[PDB]
Amino acid sequence: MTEYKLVVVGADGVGKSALTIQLIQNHFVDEYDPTIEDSYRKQVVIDGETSLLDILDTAGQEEYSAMRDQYMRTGEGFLLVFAINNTKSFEDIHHYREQIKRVKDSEDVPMVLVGNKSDLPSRTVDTKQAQDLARSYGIPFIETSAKTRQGVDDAFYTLVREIRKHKEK
Ligand SMILES: C#Cc1c(F)ccc2cc(O)cc(-c3ncc4c(N5C[C@H]6CC[C@@H](C5)N6)nc(OC[C@@]56CCCN5C[C@H](F)C6)nc4c3F)c12
Ligand SMILES: Nc1nc2c(ncn2[C@@H]2O[C@H](COP(=O)(O)OP(=O)(O)CP(=O)(O)O)[C@@H](O)[C@H]2O)c(=O)[nH]1
Ligand SMILES: [Mg+2]
Numbered sequence: 001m002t003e004y005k006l007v008v009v010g011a012d013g014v015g016k017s018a019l020t021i022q023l024i025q026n027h028f029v030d031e032y033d034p035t036i037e038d039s040y041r042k043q044v045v046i047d048g049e050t051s052l053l054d055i056l057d058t059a060g061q062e063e064y065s066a067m068r069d070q071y072m073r074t075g076e077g078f079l080l081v082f083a084i085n086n087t088k089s090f091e092d093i094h095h096y097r098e099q100i101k102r103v104k105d106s107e108d109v110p111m112v113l114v115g116n117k118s119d120l121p122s123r124t125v126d127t128k129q130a131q132d133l134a135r136s137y138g139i140p141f142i143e144t145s146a147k148t149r150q151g152v153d154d155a156f157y158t159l160v161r162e163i164r165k166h167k168e169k
Contacts (some may be wrong), residue, residue, distance in 0.1 A: 010081035018146035
């Protein structure tokens with residue numbers, strides 16, 4: 001069975017774990033341990049292909065050991081998550097993309113930009129700003145809410161499709 005290694009990255013509090021748990025368990029809860037980093041799996045059918053998604057939900061201290069580089073390098077695609085109510089989380093996207101390009105040693109890594117917490121009224125990052133950034137990176141942009149489930153399947157399935165496009169090259 002086909003398997004895809006997906007990694008969910010971004011600033012604290014943006015909703016990486018809530019997104020992951022929506023994908024796997026189809027629900028939202030008010031609280032998630034902010035400290036837990038681990039991998040999870042879901043079996044999915046995307047465009048008729050059955051596959052296993054192994055999802056690394058990142059967390060924990062900001063450290064750059066060689067071991068951490070090597071683990072990140074096994075990721076085949078990355079969700080770059082920010083929250084639409086947190087400008088700093090959007091500003092930090094650049095850094096996460098640089099670290100991915102560094103460990104993958106490539107300017108062509110499958111990535112999707114994800115603007116999470118789309119249900120909240122307290123927007124500080126404009127949709128247009130995010131679209132322009134994703135266009136500049138050459139990657140898709142998906143608006144999500146882990147709370148309502150808006151966009152969640154689309155974000156993960158779009159990342160799988162980006163991985164397939166890379167595999168065709
Ligand atoms: C992820 C990943 C990541 C990759 F995708 C790819 C390759 C990587 C190779 C690494 O060896 C290591 C990583 C990696 N591991 C953890 C990070 C992290 N933490 C602290 C918090 C926020 C998320 C979670 C984990 N808990 N924080 C920031 O950056 C935070 C900011 C704010 C304070 C200063 N820095 C610089 C920028 F300004 C942004 N980067 C991180 C990072 F790159 C990598
Ligand atoms: N309204 C709303 N709340 C969200 C959404 N996604 C996550 N949350 C909430 O935001 C907070 C952070 O959620 P969490 O999933 O732990 O984020 P994280 O990015 O995993 C935090 P860490 O970086 O420490 O692992 C929680 O209170 C969570 O329920 C969303 O789409 N909408
Ligand atoms: Mg988390």
